[PDB]
Write a protein that binds this ligand. Structure first.
Ligand code: MG
Ligand code: MG
Ligand code: MG
Ligand code: MG
Ligand code: MG
Ligand code: MG
Ligand code: MG
Ligand code: MG
Ligand code: MG
Ligand code: MG
Ligand code: MG
Ligand code: MG
Ligand code: MG
Ligand code: MG
Ligand code: MG
Ligand code: MG
Ligand code: MG
Ligand code: MG
Ligand code: MG
Ligand code: MG
Ligand code: MG
Ligand code: MG
Ligand code: MG
Ligand code: MG
Ligand code: MG
Ligand code: MG
Ligand code: MG
Ligand code: MG
Lengths: 70, 75, 90, 145, 141, 64, 187, 68, 46
RNA sequence: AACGAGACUCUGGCAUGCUAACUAGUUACGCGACCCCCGAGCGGUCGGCGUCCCCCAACUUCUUAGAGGGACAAGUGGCGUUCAGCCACCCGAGAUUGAGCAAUAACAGGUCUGUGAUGCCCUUAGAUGUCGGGGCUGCACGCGCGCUACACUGACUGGCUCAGCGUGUGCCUACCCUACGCCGGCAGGCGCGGGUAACCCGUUGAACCCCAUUCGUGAUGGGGAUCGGGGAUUGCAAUUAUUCCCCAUGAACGAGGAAUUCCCAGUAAGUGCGGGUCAUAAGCUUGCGUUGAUUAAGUCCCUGCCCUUUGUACACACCGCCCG
């Protein structure tokens, strides 16, 4: 649910900047891009984060099961 | 653990205190009325709704989790 | 109900306190010669010499006489001490 | 609002008058909460009034439903005692009928000394549970002699 | 306005209040003594739960015209708490989902389409969009 | 038995002292007479240039 | 108006910070005005990057704690929203300034490290001030509402209020001054 | 990080400069092509690191002489 | 049983139960004294 | 000069550039059809909703997967004996993604119960090489890996709306995943199609979460042990209850002493879903996504590790040796 709010929020603004850049002048889209990128990045540049893969030994990716010495 | 005593329906003294507590408060939530009076809380909700039906209070935000009121939106 | 002619104990008085919780940098103890405003004794002030286990000195529910050193007579901070007692005062 | 009597003594047990009537009558044994809602629904009673807000005639309407469920059209798969082992009836044992029916069932089992009767006797676990590391009531034992 | 134009909860309340305003739509006899799924622990509070359930069922048929009972019981599945063991996903009740779809065919709002399944009749969609506009006009949407 | 607060600005970070290397050595100014200077030992993550707060400007700690 | 932003309702530009030590480490005005306390925000990737994070989002992140809340953030935003709405009633003042006050008056400006029980006194860095104040006043709330009829929004609100004016009736202040007296003794 | 070029990267880059010195200019993307033409580097990753040390050495050799 | 045949006279109340349900496969336990490994403290021999 | 390190191989992140797709699509209109006026209009036309039906339309943005491209401490500024390199910053999809593979010398480590790998010893027709029954589950007690909880940052009842890795008819062996209709409150039953699989289950209507209702600080509707009664499925057979469903019973437990485990970013934790075993069948394990923090950018204090110098009466090597 939440990871689609950011997909939408990034896609529409990445669109209004390519409808300008193609069918309007160039120097008008430089206004959009700086009103946009100065407020919050990742309205044009996607997050490169993806889940890491579990490994044997622990429940998730970095934890490990309990160790009982004695 | 102790015995937080609470009533499920009013007695005349408490009913008077309800129809007179309205101005005294700038924060009217079920919890605060259930604690300052000896009210179960399912009774405070009904009483607050009853008052709100009388325009005596003003509802400022209602949520599934928490409800609030205000004094009169006056003064 | 109050025990004595002043509700806040004065500095340099020996008080009867029932230790209640051993804190991380002290202990939160009741007040029993005055009304139950909290008290905090610093762990640096139980005994004059090195200690093997705190449960051998203080444990919940043990009346003991301790001396207050400082107090914010306004905010309510009763600073308490045990190194500084003779068994006659007790 | 509604300052008349609240507590009521339904058969052999003290039903507190404060709780919502559904969760009020559950203080009867043999009557859980899923059965109680059905009883109250078939009794037409409102489900937003506490036990204190019912007069002396609705309560009989509810009792007679709890006691004779089969006839108020509560199906035969709600009743806690089914094809009763000694006589084939279907019913809800209510208050001490539950105690006596458990008592009679354990006696019935021990009488022919079935493997469950002996487990009830010796005071152990009757279903198939392991018992090596569970239950564990008794006192610690030492290796010293 | 269509149905996607309006808030999908008050629309459901309106459709339920309308369905229970025609006298049609026969309800099953056991409507008041049923758990409603394998994983629930109680019977529904709202005495009119069949009307709400039929309303939501019709709406769901509108948005995806090929359901059949084996998905009404998935659309309505939930989470079962197995006592002292971890929970698990569990389906709805087949029997009430079946009797809901059957009760809607009696209003001529539903019909068994080609292949297999169900969809709304042309006359069902009108009945929906009308109260959709009713909702949009009441709440000013 | 009564002293006002003082506000210093960090001018250089020296090293991370303490037994577990927890506290940090730091050299500070004094923001009213920038001539003064002491060496102090802070507990959080100091950067450079940010305004500390001293409750007794007279001390000058010298190790762990 | 469109050059200026709100948490739906509350204004930022009327705020003030009076501790010149904390002006670098509380973000509220200007380029730190955001519409919601919820951003993806790869803040915890470098050392000081956490200082750029809008203070209301930091107040949210530090609230989902003790196990059966890890991750549930939308609940936290709906809690904070309600807390501020209550604060505006109990005072009639701007909620953001009260938050800034309750953060400033909870950072212990001196703590005691351990060397050997033998301690020593040290001063706390300006970043640890806010990092401790947040922890303290979010623990006060979570603690005051664990088996009471009050709701966490109510307790968090009255905590922020009783702390923004140091009152000895709030967990944060008690613990701060008590952490400072222990340092004062073994100076 | 690291970024300490191994002796198999610091020996290619030393032979290449001796043989082809008049091609190896001072930018990286042209050297990345010259090195790919002259020698046989059996990877892209290694080719880039070799061509990236070549540029360092070239910048240094436009001052006084280097001892390899 | 697993080694013996145990006699059982059939009563009417045994109806619908199983035969094996009247002939248990083990002796009921009653405990001895704990041995030399019984407690985490118990292990030591010179 | 050789090995190990590194290089290497797989994987994650970027291409609106290439190759090219009824077993993936999108946009268009050829469409047409349904529906509402929901807006100009009137209702069509202008438009709006479509996992409604088409195209012998156009293309490859989304999907799939091949070839190449890209990142080099390369640029700029400091610190470096101006070397090897470190620090910050710019442009950027990214300036430290995660695994596999791994040396010399050893250990009286584990495994003869994986092997038609195997020496010696034993038993070999009254068998230590087959059928029927019982046991590995037995309970005064000590310990280990775990699951569910002690509630209001919650439980219950409705309503709303989102995935990714996968497996699937069995060669003796003899069984697969399931759509859609009907019957039953529920587990389940009957009927009749698809699938040897980007084709069918399937647009995988997953849980937490989200929105609205009841309860009210009370071992309470928290918690769900223990126990009574009844109904189905698997199988040759269910008792010491295989599993599953319903009514009923309603224990300890109010955040846990001394101690002690794991963990640095899509990580800890919460949350569900596939694989393995599997006639029936996870409180396990191996993977997958989903909501997603607090604290650090350090040190040699504790437990250990690597390199140099130094001391030794030790070499089975300090768990050593040795005096009355
Ligand atoms: Mg996980
Ligand atoms: Mg849980
Ligand atoms: Mg790679
Ligand atoms: Mg990919
Ligand atoms: Mg489609
Ligand atoms: Mg490639
Ligand atoms: Mg340089
Ligand atoms: Mg950039
Ligand atoms: Mg790597
Ligand atoms: Mg090795
Ligand atoms: Mg072997
Ligand atoms: Mg052998
Ligand atoms: Mg054999
Ligand atoms: Mg056998
Ligand atoms: Mg075993
Ligand atoms: Mg293990
Ligand atoms: Mg629910
Ligand atoms: Mg088994
Ligand atoms: Mg699993
Ligand atoms: Mg299976
Ligand atoms: Mg399985
Ligand atoms: Mg296993
Ligand atoms: Mg070394
Ligand atoms: Mg030597
Ligand atoms: Mg030597
Ligand atoms: Mg020797
Ligand atoms: Mg020896
Ligand atoms: Mg020795």
């Amino acid at each position: 649910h939440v990871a689609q709010i950011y997909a939408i929020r990034q896609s529409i603004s990445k669109a209004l900047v390519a409808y300008y850049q193609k069918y309007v002048d160039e120097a008008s889209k430089k206004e959009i891009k700086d009103i946009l990128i100065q407020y919050d990045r990742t309205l044009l540049v996607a997050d490169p984060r993806r889940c890491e893969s579990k490994k044997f030994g622990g429940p998730g990716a970095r934890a490990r099961y309990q160790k009982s010495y004695r | 653990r102790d015995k937080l005593n609470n009533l499920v329906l009013f007695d005349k003294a408490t009913y008077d205190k309800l129809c007179k507590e309205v101005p005294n408060y700038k924060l009217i939530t079920p919890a605060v009325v259930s604690e300052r009076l000896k009210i179960r809380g399912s009774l405070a909700r009904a009483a607050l709704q009853e008052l709100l039906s009388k325009g005596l209070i003003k509802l400022v935000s209602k949520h599934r989790a928490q409800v609030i009121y205000t004094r009169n939106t006056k003064g | 109900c109050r025990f004595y002619q002043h509700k806040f104990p004065e500095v340099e008085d020996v008080v009867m306190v029932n230790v209640r919780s051993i804190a991380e940098m002290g202990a939160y103890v009741s007040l029993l010669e005055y009304n139950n405003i909290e008290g905090m004794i610093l762990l640096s002030e139980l005994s004059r010499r090195r200690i093997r286990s705190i449960n051998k000195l203080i444990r919940i529910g043990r009346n003991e006489c301790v001396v207050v050193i400082r107090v914010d007579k306004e905010k309510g901070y009763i600073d308490l001490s045990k190194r500084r007692v003779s068994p006659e005062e007790a | 609002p509604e300052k008349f009597q609240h507590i009521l003594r339904v058969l052999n047990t003290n039903i507190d008058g404060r709780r919502k009537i559904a969760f009020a009558i559950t203080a009867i044994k043999g009557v859980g909460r899923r059965y109680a809602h059905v009883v109250l629904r078939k009794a037409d009673i409102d489900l937003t009034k506490r036990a204190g807000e019912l007069t002396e005639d609705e309560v009989e309407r509810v009792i007679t439903i709890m006691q004779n469920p089969r006839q108020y059209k509560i199906p035969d798969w709600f009743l806690n005692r089914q094809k009763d082992v000694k006589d084939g009836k279907y019913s809800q044992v209510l208050a001490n009928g539950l105690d006596n029916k458990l008592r009679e069932d354990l006696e019935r089992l021990k009488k022919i000394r079935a493997h469950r009767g002996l487990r009830h006797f010796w005071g152990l676990r009757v279903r198939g549970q392991h018992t090596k590391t569970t239950g564990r009531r008794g006192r610690t034992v030492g290796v010293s002699k | 306005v269509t149905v996607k134009d309006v808030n999908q909860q008050e629309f459901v309340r309106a459709l339920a209040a309308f369905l229970k305003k025609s006298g049609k739509l026969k309800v099953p006899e056991w409507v008041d003594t049923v758990k409603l799924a394998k994983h629930k622990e109680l019977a529904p509070y709202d005495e009119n739960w069949f009307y709400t359930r039929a309303a939501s069922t019709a709406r769901h048929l509108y948005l995806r015209g090929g359901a059949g009972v084996g998905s009404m019981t998935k659309i309505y599945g939930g989470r079962q708490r197995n006592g002292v063991m971890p929970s698990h996903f569990s389906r709805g009740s087949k029997s009430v989902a079946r009797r809901v779809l059957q009760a809607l065919e009696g209003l001529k709002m539903v019909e068994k389409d080609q292949d297999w399944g169900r969809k709304l009749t042309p006359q069902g969609q009108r009945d929906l969009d009308r109260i959709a506009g009713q909702v949009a006009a009441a709440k000013k949407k | 038995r009564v002293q006002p607060i003082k506000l210093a600005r960090v001018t250089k970070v020296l090293g991370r002292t303490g037994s577990q290397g927890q506290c940090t050595q730091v050299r500070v100014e004094f923001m009213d007479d920038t001539s003064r200077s002491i060496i102090r030992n802070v507990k959080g993550p100091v950067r450079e240039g940010d305004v500390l707060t001293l409750l007794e400007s007279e001390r000058e700690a010298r190790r762990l | 108006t469109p050059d200026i932003k709100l948490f739906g309702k509350w204004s930022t530009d009327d705020v003030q910070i009076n501790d010149i030590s904390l002006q670098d480490y509380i973000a509220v005005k200007e380029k730190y005005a955001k519409y919601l306390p919820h951003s993806a925000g790869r803040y915890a990737a470098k050392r000081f990057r956490k200082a750029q994070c809008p203070i209301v989002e930091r107040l949210t992140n530090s609230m989902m704690m003790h196990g059966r809340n890890n991750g549930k953030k939308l609940m936290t935003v709906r809690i904070v929203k309600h807390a501020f709405e209550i604060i505006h009633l109990l005072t009639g003042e701007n909620p953001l300034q009260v938050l800034v006050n309750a953060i400033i008056n909870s950072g212990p400006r001196e703590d005691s490290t351990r060397i050997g029980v033998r301690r020593q006194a040290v001063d706390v860095s300006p970043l640890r001030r806010v990092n401790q104040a947040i922890w303290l006043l979010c623990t006060g709330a979570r603690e005051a509402a664990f088996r009471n009829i009050k709701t966490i929004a109510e307790c968090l609100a009255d905590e922020l209020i009783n702390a923004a004016k140091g009152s000895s009736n709030s967990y944060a202040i008690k613990k701060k001054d008590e952490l400072e007296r222990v340092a004062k003794s073994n100076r | 990080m690291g970024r300490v070029r191994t002796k198999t990267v610091k020996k290619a880059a030393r032979v290449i400069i001796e043989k082809y010195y008049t091609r190896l200019g001072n930018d990286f993307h042209t050297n990345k092509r010259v090195c790919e033409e002259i020698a046989i580097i059996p990877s892209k990753k290694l080719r880039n690191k070799i061509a990236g040390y070549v540029t360092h050495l070239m910048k240094r050799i436009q001052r006084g002489p280097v001892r390899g | 049983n697993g080694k013996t045949f145990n006699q059982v006279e059939i009563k009417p109340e045994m109806i619908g139960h199983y035969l094996g349900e009247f002939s248990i496969t083990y002796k009921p336990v009653k405990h001895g004294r704990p041995g030399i490994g019984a407690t985490h403290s118990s292990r030591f021999i010179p």
